[PDB]
């Protein structure tokens, strides 16, 4: 029995060991209560405004679109405290943990942004934070690991399975399966067992709500389409949510195409994977023919969650949202383009969304279109990656 529907069509559910069901029911009840609680909402809004810096800018990018009939705005989640949209929902979940009387936080991280976001929220709000991270990710994300430690978090390498994000996801759930009475599991995307896909959407939906108000103010209408990259789905669902009922507004999710869909080295489960059951949910995922979970490949480490949130799979199934892919090379060009023509260094994750918008413009340059790209983060973290690619290809 649950208060809310755990499914989006056929997708979603609560595929956890029986021992964890009371933790999910507790979290759901606490969420439902918090959403009706004006004091909770006020506290959340206060942190978002005065600590994280909301509302974020909506920037019109004129240089990039000059000579076409595309008008392109970027929603500047890159300007949020921490440098990515992840900060919004970790503040909300930290408040839910406190509402439930918990003083400890568990989190998984891959590339490290969720770990950092969890560590910062936990530092601010007096929670003891422990973060699981695949050992291969630990080795390759020394900056983010150091940030987490500076913020007082315990970072625990995970050596099991593939020693990457999915293995950290497992380890977090193993811990919670014994510690849920005192610890909250601060899941990092709009995926996993109910109620997480719902909670994360609701704690990211200010992106789309702001975008809608900002576009109406500047343009006097709704956008033709809003475009967002899709790793696990949090930034995209946060942009999309407030527009779902605006049937004229296109919702475009961009999965990583890696070296190319046809190579198999990609991270695009929604369009090119197979539905399975893993990480507490029924959803498209990257898996072998016999059902072992595989890795999502992208130049962008932040787009390596090997599945996708169930609400995206549902919105695709009914044709409300459309999902596309962008390759490493396309993302890299978009990254370079934004730096050179707008003076904004985008995260390589976000660069996938921008690349698709640039394609929409370039393919049909005399099509009138008002587009918003969710610029989910800044790309300072990516400059070494990009430097290394440009040098290796001899640019």
């Amino acid at each position: 029995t649950t208060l809310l529907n755990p499914y989006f069509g056929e997708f979603g559910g609560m595929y956890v060991p029986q021992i964890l069901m009371p933790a999910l029911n507790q979290l759901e009840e606490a969420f439902v209560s918090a959403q009706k609680d004006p004091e909770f909402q006020a506290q959340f809004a206060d942190l978002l405004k005065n600590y994280a810096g909301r509302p974020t800018a909506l920037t019109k990018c004129q240089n990039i679109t000059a000579g076409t009939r595309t008008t392109l705005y970027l929603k500047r989640e890159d300007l949020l405290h921490g440098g990515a949209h992840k900060t919004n929902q970790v503040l909300g979940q930290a408040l839910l943990a406190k509402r439930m009387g918990k003083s400890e936080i568990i989190a998984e991280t891959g590339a490290g942004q969720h770990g950092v976001a969890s560590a910062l929220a936990s530092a601010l709000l007096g929670l003891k934070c422990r973060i699981y991270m695949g050992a291969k990710d630990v080795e390759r994300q020394s900056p983010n690991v150091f940030r987490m430690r500076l913020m007082g978090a315990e970072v625990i390498p995970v050596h099991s399975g593939s020693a990457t994000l999915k293995d950290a996801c497992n380890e977090a759930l193993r811990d919670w399966s014994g510690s849920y009475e005192t610890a909250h599991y601060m899941l990092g995307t709009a995926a996993g067992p109910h109620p997480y896909p719902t909670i994360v959407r609701e704690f990211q939906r200010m992106i789309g709500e702001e975008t809608k108000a900002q576009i109406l103010d500047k343009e006097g209408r709704l956008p033709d389409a809003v475009i967002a990259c899709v790793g696990g789905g949090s930034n995209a669902i946060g942009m999309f949510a407030d527009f779902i009922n605006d049937t004229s507004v296109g919702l475009i999710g961009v999965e990583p195409g890696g070296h190319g869909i046809e190579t198999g080295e990609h991270g695009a489960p929604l369009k090119h994977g197979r539905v399975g059951i893993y990480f507490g949910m029924k959803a498209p995922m990257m898996q072998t023919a016999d059902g072992q979970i595989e890795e999502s490949y992208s130049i962008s480490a932040g787009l390596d969650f090997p599945s996708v949130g169930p609400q995206h799979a549902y919105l695709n199934s009914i044709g409300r949202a459309d999902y596309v892919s962008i390759t490493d090379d396309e993302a890299l060009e978009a990254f370079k383009t934004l730096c050179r023509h707008e003076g904004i260094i985008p995260a390589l994750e976000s660069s996938h969304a921008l690349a698709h918008a640039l394609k929409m413009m370039r393919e049909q340059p005399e099509k009138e279109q008002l587009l918003v790209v969710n610029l989910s983060g800044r790309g300072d973290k990516d400059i070494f990656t990009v430097h290394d690619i440009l040098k290796a290809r001899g640019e």
């Binding site: 609560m14 956890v16 029986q18 021992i19 193993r174 399966s177 029924k282 016999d290 059902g291």
Partner: protein, 267 residues
Amino acid sequence: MERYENLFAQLNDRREGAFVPFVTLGDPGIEQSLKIIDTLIDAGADALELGVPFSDPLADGPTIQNANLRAFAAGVTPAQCFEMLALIREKHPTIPIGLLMYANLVFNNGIDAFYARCEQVGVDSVLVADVPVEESAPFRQAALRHNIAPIFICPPNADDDLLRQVASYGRGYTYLLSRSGVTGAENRGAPLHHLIEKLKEYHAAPALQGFGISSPEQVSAAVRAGAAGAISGSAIVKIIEKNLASPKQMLAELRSFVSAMKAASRA
């Protein structure tokens, strides 16, 4: 078939508990795993719980995480596991064989087809570790269509509604969890006689206590509390891990251990 029903009736006639080891199929390779399993049986195992190697065993502690990894290192696939299971059943006609699965391996090629393959090879039960009662319907329905017992987990904190659900839905045995957390011999768990009594009142499948069982005294205690028997996994797998370099010594130590554990179950 009725392999668990027959086993528990026979054990009852002897005022005897069941001892049930867990191992990972194909750990540390197919041939040695087959010999391990024959040893467990010869040494006194009443039933088996057998794991299919899975990439993401999120209810398992490090001991069994490592067992899965060793089987993967040996190239073990679900298909090869089903080959193993057919051969185990062809050697041993009455011993109940239960699988420990994760949901993706069951759903992968279709839930019905998975349980049909279990029936074909002579498996008696399936426990899907990441499927709670709330999600169980297609799994338990397919199990029963194929004469497979769906095994439900009873947490040590189960309320009356859950006990009634597990009692009604389950067959074969009811898995009585010792404690919260994940598999492992390090953490000893369960104070379960209250649940045991309620499950009996609700005509549940007989209870087997599992998680943290690593010593004879715990087997004795489980039966004394009214359970039909006990499951031990990590303690068995630790003997495999410790003795990888000497397959002969591995089998000798497995035999000794299982003999002692089974002795604890006797009246």
